[PDB]
Nucleic acid binder design. Structure first.
Ligand SMILES: [Mg+2]
Ligand SMILES: [Mg+2]
Ligand SMILES: [Mg+2]
Ligand SMILES: [Mg+2]
Ligand SMILES: [Mg+2]
Ligand SMILES: [Mg+2]
Ligand SMILES: [Mg+2]
Ligand SMILES: [Mg+2]
Ligand SMILES: [Mg+2]
Lengths: 79, 100, 206, 99, 107, 127
RNA sequence: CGCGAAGAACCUUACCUGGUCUUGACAUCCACGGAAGUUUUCAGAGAUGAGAAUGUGCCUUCGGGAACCGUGAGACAGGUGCUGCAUGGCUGUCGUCAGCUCGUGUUGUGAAAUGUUGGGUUAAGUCCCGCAACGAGCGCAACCCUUAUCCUUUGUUGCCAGCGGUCCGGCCGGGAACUCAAAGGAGACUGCCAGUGAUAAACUGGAGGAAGGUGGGGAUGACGUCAAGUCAUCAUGGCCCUUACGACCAGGGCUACACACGUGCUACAAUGGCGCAUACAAAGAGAAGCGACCUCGCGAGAGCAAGCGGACCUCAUAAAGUGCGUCGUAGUCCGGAUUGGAGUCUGCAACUCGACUCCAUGAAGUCGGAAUCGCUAGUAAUCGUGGAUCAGAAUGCCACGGUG
C-alpha cells in the first residue's frame, strides 16, 4: 500500500517507545495513533489503542511487526 | 454556510501560505531526492511536527458569497445558484443561456 | 407555470450585459468577486439615491463604474464630494485605481428596478397593493411605454394565506426575442414576511 | 523585426470595431500589414443546476465565447508605433503586444 | 401512425450484387452497427450455398426465400437469421448456409 | 486543366482534383486498395462513376480529413459529383436522378439534459 | 430512491465519544499594553501554558493616530435548532397539450351566453368560409442561435494545387488556389407548374434547388393544478438556547449487516476470446498546471528534462474495424467475482475506508417468471474520447465523435 521510502510512524508515539525501552515496561500506554507502523523495538509492550470511545490494550507480538495499530481495534460493536 | 465554518477556511489558507508554501515544499523535495540522503533524510519526521491545518488537502473550495461547499466552480469562485443570480442581472460578463 | 428569466435570456441579442470587462483564466475569478463587493457597497450606501443599474468595465490597468440613477444630485453631492469618497474606496476593493461615472436615468418609471423599488417602499408605508400597482403602471404609460405589467405575491396586506395578483396594461410579448424587456426583482421585507415584486416593461421591438 | 497584436474579447460585434481602428490607422501611416486573421473561437460551455433540491432534470445551459483576432505588422515604423501604442479602444478588449 | 401516415425508407442496395433485397438481409444479422463483420458472414454463407449447394447464387437464395414466405419478405428473412443462431455448427456463416439449404428443400 | 469539387459529411472534408486520362486513384498519398480497408467503401465511390463511364479516362487526386470509414467515403462520393458538374455541365440530369449530389446533412443529435443520450431516457417506474 | 451531495481516508461534517473554551471560533465600539510581522523554543492526541532574536513604516501645535497582537468591561456576536400549514424567490407536473381572456356590440329579468357552438383544413384557438358578432391580447408560430449550399473580407501557429528543393518531414523558398479558421451577406417564400378542393384555406404530385412543404437540432413551457420540493443555497416574520442548541481539537461514524426495494456496470461468448501487424475521429483541458524527448522497470510508474498561458507545445498511440494465425461449442484460452502475496502513486497520514499495477486463485452465471421501460433515423444499439467535481478518489453525470 504505502511507498517503500520510509515507514510512517507518529512523532509522539515514537517518543513513548524510547522511554519505555530505557525505563522498562509500564502500565498500558494510552494513545490515538491508529496509523503507526509497528517496529521491532515495540515487541513486549502493551499499547492501549483508541477505538472511538475507549482504549483497548494490545500485547505486541513478534509477527505484528509491519502492521498497523488500527488493525487490532474494532471501532463498532455488533450484535 | 455557517459563519464559524467560513472562519475555519480563512484559518487554513492563512496557514497554508505560512507553513506549507515554501517549508513543506523543500521537505517534499529532499524526501524525493534519489541522489543524496537515500536512507537518513528524516524530512518526513519534521513534517509530523508541523500543524495539520496548513494542508491543501484539508481546505475546501467554497462559495465566496455564501459559503456553500457544494457546486463550486473554479471559473466563478461561487456556488451554482449564485452564478445564476449574477448571470440574470448581467453581473458576469458574456455569460448567457446557450443553445446548441 | 414556471417562467424563464426574460432579461437573462435576451442578453446579447437585444439586451447588453451589465458587465462587459474581459479577462483570461488568470484574473477572472478575483475580479468577479471584486464586482460583488462594489455592487453591494454602492447599493447600500446609495439606497436612497435610486440606483438601478451598475455598469462595470475594466481597461488594462484600471476600472470605471457607470452608476445609472434617477437622482444624480445625491450621488454627485456638493461639487463632487460624494463622488470623491466613493472613488477612493472602490480602488481599495478592486486594487487597481478606480473612477466613478454617473449616467442620469431620465425617466425612473421606465426602468424596471426603480418601479420595483418604489412598490417595495410603499408596501412598508402601508400603501395598498391595489394602489401601489396602479400608480406605477399609469405613470409609465403616460411617459411613452408600449406596455407594462407588474406582479406581487405572498401575504398581501398581512393575510395568512399567500396570494398572487398581476395587472397588465398595453402589450407585453414575453416570447418575442426582439422585444426590449426590462426585468429586475425586488423583495419587500415587512414585519409580516417577504413580498416579491416582479416588473415587466416593454420598450418596443428590435 | 515584427510586431503583432493579439485581440481577444467576448463580443463579436465589438472586437471587430477595435480591430478595424488599428488596421485602418496602420494603412494610413504607411505600414505593411497582412490583414487580420480569424483564429478559432475557444467557447466554453457550462451546465449547472437551477434547483437547490430534487427535480434534478431542470438545468441551465450557459456558455462563454472568447473570440480571437491577430494583426501582424511587418515594418516597425516610428510613426506606426507612436500612433497605435496609445489608442483609445474599448474597455472590453484586451491587447497583447509582441515586440 | 394515427395521423402521420408515411412510407418506409429505401436503403441503398448491395454493392456486390446490386440487390435491394439482400441489403435488408444483412441489416437483420447486423448487431451493434457492425456492417463490416455482418456482410462478410453473409457473403461467405452464400458462397458455401453457391459452390457446394447449387449454382445461381441469386436464385438459390430466392428458392430458400420462397418456401418461408414488403412485410412478407421482411418476416421471411427474419425467420432465417433467428433460427440460424440457435444451431449446433461452429460459425455464423456455416449455420446460415445450412438454414438456406433447408429452406430450399422446405424442411 | 483542373476540375474541382467539394464534398463532405458529419466531420469529413474531401477535395477532388481531376486531370484528363488514367485509371489512377491516389488518396492521402496511398492507393485505393491500401487506404480503404472495407470493400463496401471501395465501391461507393465507384457508384457516381457508373452512369458516367470511367475506365482509364480521368485522374482523381483526393485527400480527406476527419470522419471514419463511411464518413470519408461519403465525402468523396459527394466531391466527385460536383467535379463532373464542373467537367461537363450537362451531366446534371443523370446526377439529380441518382441523388448523389444531395448533401446528407443528417448530423448527430445533441446529448440532452436529463437523459443519458439524445433520445434514450433513463429507466422509468410506473408507481 | 447514481436525489440535494459536481465526488465522507483527515478536512468536508451538520453526528458520536473524549479532551477543552466562556464578550467567546468570528464582526462592530472604547481604554490600556504591545508596531504588525519575522524567526525559533519545552510539555500535550491536539487546543496552546511559558522564553529567545528583531524591526519602531507614518505624520507627530509629542495628544499619537492607523493597521494587527495581547488584556478587560459591557452593548452584543454565534445556532445547518423549531416551522415550505407564517413567506419570498426558484423548480417539477399535466404539457410545447392548445388552450386561456379582454374591449365594444348583441341575446337573456339574471348569474351569463355569443365571439371562442358549425363546415373544412393543419403540429397547433393553424388558416379560410359560414355566422350577431366585429376586433384585440396572453399562448402557438415567427424573429434569435447552431447546422446544411454559395459569395465577400483575412491568410498565422492553419492550408499545399501549379511550381523550384530534397536528408522524403509542408520541411524551405514560395503559392492565396483549395480544406479549415470567423466577420458580414445571398439563398426556401407553396415562390412556380399540374390535379383535388365551394373560385377559399389547405392537400397531392412534379420541376428547379445544397436544402420543399414548420429542411435538421436547440433556446423558447400560457391561465392554472398538486398547501408538490426547498427555514440545510440564500433571503425572511416569529419562537427557542446562550460558561450552551455555541465554539476548539483528537479519534470514530456517515462505507455497519440477518434482509427488502429502486437505479447502473460487466457477463453468460465464436456477430466471440487471445496474439501480432495496422487505418480513420470530433470536442475540450493546461501554469502551485499539461508535462514531450531520452533512460530504467513485466507493469502501475520513476529519473532526467524541453516546449507551452497556447490553431505552435503537452495530455494524445481514439476504440470498434481491417489482415493473418489460434482456440472448435465446453462452465471453455467464455466470464471475471472473491481472496492471498508482492508493489506504484496521491496526501500530515491510505487499518477502519482510496486509486492502480503485477503474480496466483477462478464464485454465481450457459440469455433470465409474473411484471415492466426506452425508442420512428443519423434515432435505437454499440465503440471509445473529453470535461465539471477533485491533493487523490467515476460502473454516476455532463458533452463529443466513430460505425449504424
Ligand atoms: Mg446564513
Ligand atoms: Mg477534500
Ligand atoms: Mg468528517
Ligand atoms: Mg393564433
Ligand atoms: Mg414559436
Ligand atoms: Mg407550498
Ligand atoms: Mg408538503
Ligand atoms: Mg477469461
Ligand atoms: Mg415521435
Amino acid at each position: 500500500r504505502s511507498l517503500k521510502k520510509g515507514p510512517f510512524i507518529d512523532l509522539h508515539l515514537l517518543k513513548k517507545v524510547e522511554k519505555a525501552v530505557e525505563s522498562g515496561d509500564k502500565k498500558p500506554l494510552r494513545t490515538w495513533s491508529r496509523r503507526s507502523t509497528i517496529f521491532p523495538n515495540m515487541i513486549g509492550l502493551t499499547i492501549a489503542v483508541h477505538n472511538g470511545r475507549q482504549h483497548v490494550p494490545v500485547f505486541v507480538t513478534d509477527e505484528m511487526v509491519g502492521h498497523k495499530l488500527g488493525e487490532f481495534a474494532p471501532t463498532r460493536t455488533y450484535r | 454556510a455557517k459563519q464559524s465554518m467560513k472562519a475555519r477556511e480563512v484559518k487554513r489558507v492563512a496557514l497554508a501560505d505560512k507553513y506549507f508554501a515554501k517549508r513543506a515544499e523543500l521537505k517534499a523535495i529532499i524526501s524525493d531526492v534519489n541522489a543524496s540522503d537515500e536512507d537518513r533524510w528524516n524530512a518526513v519526521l519534521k513534517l509530523q511536527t508541523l500543524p495539520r491545518d496548513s494542508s491543501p488537502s484539508r481546505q475546501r473550495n467554497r462559495c465566496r458569497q455564501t459559503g456553500r461547499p457544494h457546486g463550486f466552480l473554479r471559473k466563478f469562485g461561487l456556488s451554482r445558484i449564485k452564478v445564476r443570480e449574477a448571470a440574470m442581472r448581467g453581473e458576469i460578463p458574456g455569460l448567457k443561456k446557450a443553445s446548441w | 407555470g414556471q417562467k424563464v428569466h426574460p432579461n437573462g435570456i435576451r442578453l446579447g441579442i437585444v439586451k447588453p450585459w451589465n458587465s462587459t470587462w474581459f479577462a483570461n483564466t488568470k484574473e477572472f475569478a478575483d475580479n468577479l468577486d471584486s464586482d460583488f463587493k462594489v455592487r453591494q457597497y454602492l447599493t447600500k450606501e446609495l439606497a436612497k439615491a435610486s440606483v438601478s443599474r451598475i455598469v462595470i468595465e475594466r481597461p488594462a490597468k484600471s476600472i470605471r463604474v457607470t452608476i445609472h440613477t434617477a437622482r444624480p444630485g445625491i450621488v454627485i453631492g456638493k461639487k463632487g464630494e460624494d463622488v470623491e469618497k466613493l472613488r477612493k474606496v472602490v480602488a481599495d476593493i478592486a486594487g487597481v485605481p478606480a473612477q466613478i461615472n454617473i449616467a442620469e436615468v431620465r425617466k425612473p418609471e421606465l426602468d424596471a428596478k426603480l418601479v420595483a423599488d418604489s412598490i417595495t417602499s410603499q408596501l412598508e408605508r402601508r400603501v395598498m397593493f391595489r394602489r401601489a400597482m396602479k400608480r406605477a403602471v399609469q405613470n409609465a404609460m403616460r411617459l411613452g411605454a408600449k406596455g407594462i405589467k407588474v406582479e406581487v405575491s405572498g401575504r398581501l396586506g398581512g393575510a395568512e394565506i399567500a396570494r398572487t395578483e398581476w395587472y397588465r396594461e398595453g402589450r407585453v410579448p414575453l416570447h418575442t426575442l426582439r422585444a426590449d424587456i426590462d426585468y429586475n426583482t425586488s423583495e419587500a421585507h415587512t414585519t409580516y414576511g417577504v413580498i416579491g415584486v416582479k416588473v415587466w416593461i416593454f420598450k418596443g421591438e428590435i | 523585426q515584427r510586431i503583432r497584436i493579439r485581440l481577444k474579447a467576448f463580443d463579436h460585434r465589438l472586437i471587430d470595431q477595435a480591430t478595424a481602428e488599428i488596421v485602418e490607422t496602420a494603412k494610413r501611416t504607411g505600414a505593411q500589414v497582412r490583414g487580420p486573421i480569424p483564429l478559432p473561437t475557444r467557447k466554453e460551455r457550462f451546465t449547472v443546476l437551477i434547483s437547490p433540491h430534487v427535480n434534478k432534470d431542470a438545468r441551465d445551459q450557459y456558455e462563454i465565447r472568447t473570440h480571437l483576432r491577430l494583426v501582424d505588422i511587418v515594418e516597425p515604423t516610428e510613426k506606426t508605433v507612436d500612433a497605435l501604442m496609445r489608442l483609445d479602444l474599448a474597455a472590453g478588449v484586451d491587447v497583447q503586444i509582441s515586440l | 401512425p394515427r395521423r402521420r401516415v408515411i412510407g418506409q425508407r429505401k436503403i441503398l442496395p448491395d454493392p456486390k450484387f446490386g440487390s435491394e433485397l439482400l441489403a435488408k438481409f444483412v441489416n437483420i444479422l447486423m448487431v451493434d452497427g457492425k456492417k463490416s463483420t455482418a456482410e462478410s458472414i453473409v457473403y461467405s454463407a452464400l458462397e458455401t450455398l453457391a459452390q457446394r449447394s447449387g449454382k445461381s447464387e441469386l436464385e438459390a437464395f430466392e428458392v430458400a426465400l420462397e418456401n418461408v414466405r414488403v412485410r412478407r419478405n421482411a418476416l421471411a428473412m427474419r425467420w432465417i437469421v433467428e433460427a440460424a443462431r440457435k444451431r449446433g455448427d461452429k460459425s455464423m456463416a456455416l449455420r446460415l448456409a445450412n438454414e438456406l439449404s433447408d429452406a430450399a428443400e422446405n424442411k | 486543366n483542373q476540375y474541382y469539387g467539394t464534398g463532405r459529411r458529419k466531420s469529413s472534408a474531401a477535395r477532388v482534383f481531376i486531370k484528363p486520362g488514367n485509371g489512377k486513384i491516389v488518396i492521402n498519398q496511398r492507393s485505393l486498395e491500401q487506404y480503404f480497408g472495407r470493400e463496401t467503401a471501395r465501391m461507393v465511390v465507384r457508384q457516381p462513376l457508373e452512369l458516367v463511364d470511367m475506365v482509364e479516362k480521368l485522374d482523381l487526386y483526393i485527400t480527406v480529413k476527419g470522419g471514419g470509414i463511411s464518413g470519408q467515403a461519403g465525402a468523396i462520393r459527394h466531391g466527385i459529383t460536383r467535379a463532373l458538374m464542373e467537367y461537363d455541365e450537362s451531366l446534371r440530369s443523370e446526377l439529380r436522378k441518382a441523388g448523389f449530389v444531395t448533401r446528407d446533412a443528417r448530423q448527430v443529435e445533441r446529448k440532452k439534459v436529463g437523459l443519458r443520450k439524445a433520445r434514450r431516457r433513463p429507466q422509468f417506474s410506473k408507481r
